[PDB]
Amino acid sequence: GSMEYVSRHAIDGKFVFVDQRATAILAYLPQELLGTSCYEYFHQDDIGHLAECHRQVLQTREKITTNCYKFKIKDGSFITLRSRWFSFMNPWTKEVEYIVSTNTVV
Incomplete structure (x- = not known):
């Protein structure tokens, strides 16, 4: 459904992928x-x-679950999310290119 959306993040947090369900949740x-x-x-x-x-x-290929946290949406109010993260290691260049994040409304 549309109670979650998937993003990817470079090393400073920069969004490098955002699926369209983010607009429903975050405006x-x-x-x-x-x-x-x-x-x-x-x-x-x-x-x-x-x-x-x-x-x-x-530093691991295991997934990490965050605590609940608050995310500032377009109108400046906050919603509560919880994310499951895992890193994407390129198996040839031996570099973590980004992390994958499923972002779920709490």
Whole structure:
């Protein structure tokens, strides 16, 4: 359904993929999120633990589940999300290119 959407994030949080279900949940067009960092939208209280879970997943092929956190939507209010993250290691270049994130409304 449309209670979740999938994003991908480069190493500074930059959105590099946003599926169209994000607009239903966040009221942003995908193009508004693409090229901006997820950290720009996290509630400032949540930056620290989300950044540490992001750092964790860069060093493992296992998935990491965040705590619930608040995400600032287009009108400036906050919704609560929980994300499941895993990193995408290129098996030839041996580089983590991005992380995959399923973002679920709580």
